[PDB]
């Protein structure tokens, strides 16, 4: 194996969550192993998402993880681990464009959509994030929305208080079931769309801004 095979490349690795693998009908990939092959070729391993390197995401299939959504949002190509396999085997970099992973399952099209070049799906979008999950929501979608081109994202804790939130400056409210009822009522009066995180996700999968109400799962209170 050439010691400089992957030099110049940086990598993000991700495992399809169990629900990702679950939806089956709707050597196996090993993060540590692939990392070892990558390092052996001077590949730079990024433990988390961030000019001097060509970045690539490595996974064994399309998945719905923070790392996957971040790469969809930022243009970092999602490549199949097999590109690592074939490259080591041949000891020569293959064209990753022949190993691109699908973007994800589309609610609208009702099938797995392939990935194609797109324009930042949240361009100049000003959004208000409302939730009681100061980590798995406010922090998570904030970063994703921004690297996805948002003009700005105002984080607001559901259990916090409305003494500065001027709803009329926002284009959309991305929230979850913990959204205070006073915010839902105001949004309605101001005709400010309110949606769930699935709207954000679908925007990333589809590759463009889609219908605020194009699907029931977009309603903020969609449960199970």
């Amino acid at each position: 194996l050439n010691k400089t095979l992957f030099l110049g490349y940086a990598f993000l690795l991700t495992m399809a969550t169990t629900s990702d693998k679950l939806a089956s009908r709707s050597p196996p990939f090993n993060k540590q192993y692939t990392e070892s092959q990558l390092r052996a070729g001077a590949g730079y391993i990024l433990e988390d998402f961030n000019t001097a390197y060509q970045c690539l995401l490595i996974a064994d299939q399309h998945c719905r993880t923070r790392k996957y959504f971040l790469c969809l949002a930022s243009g970092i190509p999602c490549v199949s681990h097999v590109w690592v396999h074939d490259s080591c085997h041949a000891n020569q970099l293959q064209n990753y464009r022949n190993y691109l992973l699908p973007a994800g399952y589309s609610l609208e099209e009702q099938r797995i959509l392939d990935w194609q070049p797109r324009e930042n799906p949240f361009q100049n979008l000003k959004v208000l994030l409302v939730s009681d999950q100061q980590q798995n929501f406010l922090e998570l979608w904030s970063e994703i929305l921004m690297t996805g081109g948002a003009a700005s994202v105002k984080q607001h804790h559901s259990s916090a208080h409305n003494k500065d939130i001027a709803l009329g400056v926002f284009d959309v409210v991305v929230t979850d079931p913990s959204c205070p009822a006073s915010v839902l009522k105001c949004a309605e009066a101001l005709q400010l769309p309110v949606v769930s995180q699935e709207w954000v996700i679908q925007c990333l999968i589809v590759g463009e801004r889609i219908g605020f109400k194009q699907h029931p799962k977009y309603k903020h209170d969609y449960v199970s």
Binding site: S80, V82, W83, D86, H89, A90, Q94, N95, R97, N98, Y99, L100, P102, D114, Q116, P117
Partner: protein, 187 residues
């Protein structure tokens, strides 16, 4: 700039393509869909494509076959076998011909693969093609639909005629033809 033309060109000899009729039975090796102008076939299995002409082209005429990706974002990409199947005619060509004086070409500037054979008169003349990778081959087509462009050229390589059809190399041609044909029916 580089992507080969797929423009239908019947030319002076009235060049058209034809395909045998087959069912949509879950047990069919190669079936053609006139509706979608698409062929569904299994990996490495006889794919008969018919050459029809109004006037017999002069001896020395050749029939070239080349694949290109159907989607824009992928068209400038060279269609080839996945490294998996290459490790088992040159091994990197996706389209083969069973039968002749079949010549395989690797254009030294477009890097494009193509297979050509002497054109013979019929009434139509049939050429048997083979696709050596499934449309879903990771590392190869990778789920990207392709177009097979058939061109009629003279002894020197000048265009005399051109035609094309979409292809899907898969496990169940019949099953998939029906599905994609239904897919059509409504949005």
């Amino acid at each position: 700039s580089s992507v080969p033309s797929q423009k239908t060109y019947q030319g002076s000899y009235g060049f058209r393509l034809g395909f045998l009729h087959s069912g949509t039975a879950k047990s069919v090796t190669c079936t053609y869909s006139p509706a979608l102008n698409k062929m569904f076939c299994q990996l490495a299995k006889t794919c008969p494509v018919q050459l029809w002409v109004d006037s017999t082209p002069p001896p020395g005429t050749r029939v070239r076959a080349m694949a290109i990706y159907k989607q824009s974002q992928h068209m400038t990409e060279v269609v080839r076998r996945c490294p998996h199947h290459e490790r088992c005619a040159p091994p990197q060509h996706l389209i083969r011909v069973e039968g002749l004086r079949v010549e395989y070409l690797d254009d030294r500037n477009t890097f494009r693969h193509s297979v050509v054979v002497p054109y013979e008169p019929p009434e139509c003349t049939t050429i048997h093609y083979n696709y050596m990778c499934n449309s879903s081959c990771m590392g190869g087509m990778n789920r990207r639909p392709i177009l097979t462009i058939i061109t009629l050229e003279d002894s020197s390589g000048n265009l005399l005629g051109r035609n094309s059809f979409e292809v899907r190399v898969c496990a169940c041609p019949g099953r998939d033809r029906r599905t994609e044909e239904e897919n059509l029916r409504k949005k």
